[PDB]
Design a protein around this ligand. Structure first.
Ligand code: PNS
Lengths: 1016, 928
């Protein structure tokens, strides 16, 4: 609450974490030298957050290494920068949101294929410009004139290591089609996949969504190879070399439904694409934006032309941005992608924001001193427009990612423009830092903007400024002191003139098109915005805590491994098993690995490994690598045709402590149980939660006043809670089939009735059954028994028994019947003559018989008032002879329907047979104990389905939390609707969520050579 | 609910340019062809693809293909001189860029927006292109290929060169969505316009069939190209399409801007949307669900219920498989809920023009804009019967195969334009017709004014005067200007020209491009205009023709003279016949009434006031006040038409006006200064009479030569150096005639002024104290214009300098001499050649000419505003015409204001000939 008490609490916390003197560790020394590391900093930040309510980021915590600074910044916040006087208002005129960058994909010279490699190269100041590879441009070196012309040119630049490799099998392309595809499209596809993986957004979750694609390209270089011989050219080249296909194929493969356009502004194509994506996101029209640019050096025509122009290409191939010896640039090939979302959407979806885009603008030079001559006035105007759109004063910019082409004539113009706009009004001791990534990677023609954006995103995320290389000294024609600019040639921290990191990215095409993007770091403000049963709950929680203290239980972590092919899934499982056994895998929590796996792409072939620790996970993954079956591994080669069917059974499925363990260890289950308990209290005037939380309640005559009613009410509540818990994780039934007491739950889940109506129906039924049985005793009782007679075979035996009635056809070869006890044992004795199976039920409920006749009038009066609704799900009404009802049909759940269901028999096996005939193979039962799964299996086997999926939710003598995890795992494996990300919720937003994810291996591709054989 | 969720404006279409097969180069020709149902698909021209027909394999492969489609008549022609391109550079330019430039110019002309007025403005360019076909010719021989092809064949250059040539400062991007490129470009332009970021948007698409590679590939695909080359949209015998080449452009502005600028709105764009098919049944297979979604999104953005759509411009590629999908989507969205008797009319322009790959959207938008503007629906051709696989009655669709009126189900015409690329990109644009709601939102002097107006009306009834209509003809070269003038003269003499009012021709000419070489013809009727244009055609000089070969280096200098420039009826004619002049005269009169307690408007409107002793109580003061008012009114009238001075130089009584126009003082401060000066001069002269009077005289002595003669005259003082060889001096009458007699010995020129004002001498000494007290309170301001202060020895003062117009400055100006010729010499030395005088009568123009001639400038531009015995309305028109001719700042459109908005403005413009281009053959010599 105050600075001093916060400091004392922090000292106590570090003392507890280290065991030191606890009273002499308040030094000015940093926590790192006190004995702490980066591992416990996350826990300390979480403890600070849950006590104070403020969220601290990584940069803020690291910039304050000592106890006093952290204590001051937690209470008083970050110090406010001193005000400055400006003659203009730079606030936003429009009401628009900020754009959050969540994923980065890089394909750059120097084997920079991941953002981490690119960041390491930038920190090391690596030069990625090399000579022309010996295997490149071989189609043109066989002609003596072309060969001698190429040797005269520079031909030095940034080249990709493997430009011919492509995984055509992954993208479902034939060899003939794959050979005619521009490498730009291959790079676009690969970078889209890699950016989606980096953002930790599953690709399967974006199918059918409004995702926009904006890719910038400049030249169709691969077309020339196709048309080298016009007759041998294949028609596939029309689609494989077109510029619009670069984005159209990305949209098609990933099933994106947003805008898909390819832009062309020469050297500002990537920045223009990013600007268009941002403008699309701000104006609705899209939810996720994929922006970037690609460039490939397929043929030497452009390089030879630029060399013939003269004074454009550097003799040594190095780009010396803003240096005294700048003499041109060199052409490079590569590509990059970014994933853009609205900041509110990113905050609500739990995405990790890498950087924030505040605004951007584009314009043209106009009538300059020639078509290829840059205009400083237009650059100043675009800077002003971009900073007006971003709502940020240009005086507060810390770093400028300039064009940096290394020309002796264009660098002074760019510096003059920056001094006109960015550097105007700055004090001499606060200059804007300047640099360019073209000094490292070369001039990526249509991908310069993508490289610059990736570099600045990595710099903002990692809180460091990479140096600029090939800088011998200041340009004599540029007065950096007057322009208030400084070249950053070393590794340095963000100056943070305005208190936060602000950067600008510039890029100008040779045709006069200019663009500028304003970026800022993510801030902390972007990540924000029943009395008796109570004692039983308290004592149950306190007893559960005592048992956990004696022995902590091991959580079951489901590990999801999937791919588009079974062999690829096995290879990925083997690689994951290898990674987990490594020391890095051992140092990561099993929950983090599961969370990282749950946000990967969920392919056609899926598998789930249920493990408690690292060793079990390794063993399961090793088993999954081969075809060996394992009890801890669930796998399938593909999804099933139709959705699952929920079976609302539950007769004879009660036990002593059903639902108690899941109530304490799950919040959605507890919430729905409390809701149903409140509804029953409103209806029946007593709480079922007291019975559930009680330990010594056997749901029998010796422990319950109304054993018949309470069992049905508790089973109904458990079914409703389990169904809603399944709906919480994204599961939904394709069809619903109910049984004698599960009809209310079936109606509720099918949309026929609301929760209150179904609760009133089940309460009325149970209470009438309980009350009516009390008066019926002595010789008027009716007993129910199970026989091995089918639907038609039982007609013959019933000729000898007039009073016997059929209760429910559980199985094709089994039937439940009820009647007078002297008449029930008679048919049982007759059945025993053939050596069949016959048993007498021990419950005196005696439903679906003549005994329920007096209760129809009372049932009708109590049920008068319910409002039936049209069904939103397929329904197999066992009351209506198991007839399937299409969704959207007329309401059926009227009073007469319930009267018929309570009075007449239940055609359970007919509904299951109809469901099998409709193509349903997965059956899920919501019950405290699986009792009807055997009946469903018997019905399916007789129907010609020997491999049906029978899934249970809760079972006796089984852990209820693990049982539900396994039930959802089976649904996920068979391709049913289930959000696997919901199984690993995030509890932290800022620095406390640093260890939420593990560094699992990425997806591996089998690249094959695909190229056009051409000669000249 | 289909109402708009966002608060955005509508986009108005003001200009259309067409370059389509069938020689449809103008919107009128295209509309006539659409009404006639013309088929524009022909065979391959004999002069096309000749670079590839010399190879036997390629030649035999081409003959196997279809090769029928829409081709341009002259694809190699290009006016490189007009666009300032060398032959080497012009030969390497993609014809797509040439079409983009030509269509931009033609669309700007059609919109009646001068191209020179958009230079430096935020104008966005969005052009859709699909293939770089001209690149293949360049790289046919890699060694012979020139580096110019890099810029001449790049796709971004298609828009970058348009932005560069026209000096556009807005976004310039080239889009690529195969067959929806034009629609996507239009959508991007609309979104840019709605989000600020731009004021004018140029959208469209181009396509050229340079090489047969794409056609041969599509033929080799099979089942794509129609065997006969005709597109039978929604017909029972649809068997493919044919590829065509062409382009089109549209000029887009916000509807409020178009309304305020007086532009003629042709059609209104309500909304648009774009999306993608996603994972369809193959990459090239269209998806009906995505098309339905894009229709819903576009109609949600437009804020219009799809049930109210009258006509749908469908994709209409003529495929037996895609037409049912498009019809199904239209029935899902557009046709859902309609009654059986109100179907949505269906058609496609591809049946007429063929399949313009990257220009289908431009052609469809042009067709729908023409249909909305002309209130007619053109028929759809090649329609033998309904498609058996399409149930038009169920889908509530009907093919319009005849000329029919707009059904107007919702009371207004609403149309939709659809276009889908083969890659899965879909687009839809919703258009509506322009509605009527889019084009909306001093007592005594009074009697003198009434009687003057009634007498003027009586004279006009006896004989109506003929208005002077300035005709502006301009071009980038003098020869082109002469050719255009000759063509205009030929057109005017034609019966169509005779049936058009001369004012309409002038209004049409004033909204054309104002080039480097300009000329103005001042005419009263058609015959005078014809004679002037004929004279302008040759190099013959004509008094009614003002011409110049180019602009001057520096701006004009306003001379605030006026001493001895008064006459009986100065400013009376212009007051009655001009509203801005009258408004500013009334404002100055009100200021003087506040200051001096009497109205100068009564003197101006009075007829028998000679501004002398026999007609005015205070002849000295009233003349100065009226001259100051006239100068202020003339300057503000010139500012109304866009004129602004580059520098200002004043004289003895014009210093207040010079300070006001230079930004030093406000109107009230200058009015108070001039009123105080005039009243003090008038009052002081009354007490000075008898032998103490001072007389002013003009002599032929220079600044330094007058020093020697002044040794004999101690009391004589110098008043103003009017000319390098002339000087005005003042002193005692017995001492003034003495030096005059001495000057007459050499036979020089000497005259005595008849005005007893005697300013800038010792007589004004007692008035300094009174002047300081009255002037105490003025607030000087920094100068916003160059100033040649004749008080400060004619020293030039840069704009933005410290204020100079304090009380001491006025005291020194009233007491000391005026260095008029020094300021003019400094202005000449600064590069100023144009001098404009604001006065009721040009008196100092002779002095300015004498000074400039002595300074080495024998061709200076001396322009007068008002003159004696001259029509004041025609004098001001001629003065602004000279400013326009010499390239000075002047909005020539302000000379022809529009008084009507709707149907009453139908005859505001004439059908003057368009700009003519000299097209030359520019092509790359290639062989295989
Ligand atoms: P430790 O050596 O395991 O370090 C872990 C870490 C907390 C530094 C890191 O994994 C993390 O989650 N935060 C990184 C913050 C960052 O890179 N930017 C700020 C650097 S000062």
């Amino acid at each position: 609450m105050t600075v001093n008490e916060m400091r004392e609490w922090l000292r106590n916390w570090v003392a507890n974490a280290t065991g030191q003197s606890a009273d002499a560790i308040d030094e000015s020394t940093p926590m790192v030298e006190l004995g702490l590391s980066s591992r416990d900093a996350v826990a300390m930040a979480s403890d600070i957050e849950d006590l104070t309510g403020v969220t601290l980021t990584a940069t803020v915590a690291f910039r304050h290494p000592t106890i006093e600074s952290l204590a001051t910044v937690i209470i008083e916040g970050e110090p406010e920068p001193e005000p400055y006087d400006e003659d203009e208002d730079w606030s936003r005129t429009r009401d628009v949101e900020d754009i959050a960058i969540v994923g980065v994909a890089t394909r750059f010279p120097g084997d920079l294929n991941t953002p981490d490699e690119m960041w390491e190269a930038l920190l090391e100041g690596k030069d990625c410009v090399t000579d022309l590879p010996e295997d490149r441009w071989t189609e043109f070196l066989d002609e003596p004139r072309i060969a001698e012309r190429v040797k005269k040119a520079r031909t030095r630049g940034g080249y990709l290591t493997d430009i011919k490799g492509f995984d055509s099998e992954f993208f479902a392309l034939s060899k003939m089609e794959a050979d005619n595809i521009d490498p730009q499209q291959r790079m676009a596809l690969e970078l889209t996949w890699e950016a989606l993986e980096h953002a930790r957004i599953p690709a399967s979750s974006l199918r059918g969504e409004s995702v926009g694609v904006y890719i910038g390209s400049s030249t169709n270089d691969y077309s020339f190879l196709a048309m080298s011989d016009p007759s041998i050219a294949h028609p596939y080249a029309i689609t494989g070399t077109a510029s619009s296909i670069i984005a159209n194929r990305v949209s098609y493969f990933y099933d994106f439904r947003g805008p898909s356009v390819a832009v062309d502004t020469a050297c500002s194509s990537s920045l223009v694409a990013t600007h268009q994506g941002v403008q699309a996101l701000r104006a609705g029209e899209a939810d996720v934006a994929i922006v970037g640019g690609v460039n490939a050096l397929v043929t030497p025509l452009v390089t030879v032309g630029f060399d013939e122009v003269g004074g454009v290409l550097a003799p040594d191939g190095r780009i010396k941005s803003f240096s005294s010896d700048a003499d041109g640039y060199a052409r490079s090939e590569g590509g990059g992608m970014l994933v853009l979302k609205r900041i509110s959407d990113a905050r609500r979806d739990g995405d990790q924001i890498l950087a924030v885009i505040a605004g951007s603008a584009v314009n043209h030079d106009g009538r300059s001193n020639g078509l290829l001559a840059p205009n400083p006035d237009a650059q100043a105007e675009v800077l002003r427009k971009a900073y007006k759109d971003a709502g940020i004063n240009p005086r507060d910019v810390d770093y400028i990612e300039a064009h940096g082409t290394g020309t002796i004539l264009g660098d002074p113009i760019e510096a003059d423009a920056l001094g006109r706009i960015v550097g105007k009004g700055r004090p001499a001791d606060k200059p804007a830092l300047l640099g360019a990534v073209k000094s490292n990677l070369g001039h990526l023609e249509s991908a310069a903007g993508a490289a610059s954006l990736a570099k600045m995103t990595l710099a903002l995320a990692n809180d460091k400024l990479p140096p600029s290389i090939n800088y011998a000294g200041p340009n004599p024609y540029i007065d950096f002191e007057k322009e208030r600019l400084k070249v950053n040639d070393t590794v340095s921290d963000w100056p943070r003139y305005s208190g936060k990191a602000i950067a600008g990215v510039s890029g100008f095409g040779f045709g006069g098109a200019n663009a500028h993007v304003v970026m800022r770091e993510v801030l902390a403000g972007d990540l924000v915005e029943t009395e008796a049963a109570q004692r039983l709950l308290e004592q149950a929680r306190e007893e559960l805590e005592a048992k956990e203290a004696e022995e902590p239980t091991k959580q079951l972590v489901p590990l999801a491994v999937s791919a588009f092919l079974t062999s690829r899934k096995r290879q990925a499982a083997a690689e994951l098993a290898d990674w987990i056994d490594s020391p890095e895998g051992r140092a990561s929590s099993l929950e983090s690995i599961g969370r990282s796996l749950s946000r990967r792409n969920h392919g056609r072939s899926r598998a789930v490994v249920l493990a408690h620790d690292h060793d079990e996970a390794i063993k399961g993954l090793r088993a999954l690598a081969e075809g060996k079956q394992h009890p801890s591994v669930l796998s399938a080669d593909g999804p099933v045709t139709n959705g699952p069917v929920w079976v609302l059974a539950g007769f004879g499925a009660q036990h002593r402590k059903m639902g108690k363990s899941l109530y304490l260890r799950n919040e959605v289950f507890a919430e729905w149980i409390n809701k149903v308990d409140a509804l029953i209290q409103d209806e029946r005037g007593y709480s079922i939660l007291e019975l559930i939380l009680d330990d010594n309640v056997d749901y029998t005559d010796a422990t319950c006043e109304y054993p018949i009613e309470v069992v049905q009410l508790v089973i109904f509540a458990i079914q409703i809670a389990l169904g809603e818990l399944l709906r919480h994780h994204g599961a939904k039934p394709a069809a619903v089939v109910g049984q004698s007491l599960g009809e209310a739950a079936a109606s509720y889940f099918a949309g026929g009735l609301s929760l209150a109506d179904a609760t009133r129906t089940i309460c009325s039924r149970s209470h009438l059954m309980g009350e009516g049985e009390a008066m019926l005793f002595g010789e008027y009782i009716r007993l129910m028994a199970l026989v091995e007679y089918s639907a038609d075979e039982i007609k013959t035996v019933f000729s000898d028994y007039p009073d016997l009635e059929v209760c429910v056809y559980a199985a094709p070869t089994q039937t439940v019947i009820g009647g007078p006890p002297d008449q029930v044992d008679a048919i049982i004795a007759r059945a025993e003559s053939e050596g069949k199976f016959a048993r007498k039920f021990q419950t005196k409920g005696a439903s679906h018989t003549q005994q329920m006749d007096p209760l129809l009038g009372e049932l009708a009066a109590e049920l008068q008032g319910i409002e039936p609704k049209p069904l939103t799900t397929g329904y197999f009404s066992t009351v209506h002879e198991g007839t399937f009802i299409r969704p959207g049909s007329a309401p059926i759940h009227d009073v007469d329907y319930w009267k018929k269901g309570l009075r007449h028999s239940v055609y359970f096996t007919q509904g299951i047979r109809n469901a099998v005939d409709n193509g349903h193979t997965t059956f899920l039962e919501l019950a405290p104990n699986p009792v009807a799964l055997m009946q469903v299996g018997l019905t399916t086997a007789s129907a010609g389905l020997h491999d049906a999926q029978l899934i249970a939710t809760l079972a006796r003598k089984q852990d209820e939390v693990e049982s539900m995890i396994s039930a959802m795992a089976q649904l996920y494996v068979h391709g049913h609707d289930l959000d696997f990300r919901t199984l690993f919720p995030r509890r932290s937003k800022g620095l406390a969520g640093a260890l939420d994810f593990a560094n699992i291996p990425p997806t591996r591709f089998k690249r094959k050579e695909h190229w056009l054989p051409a000669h000249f």
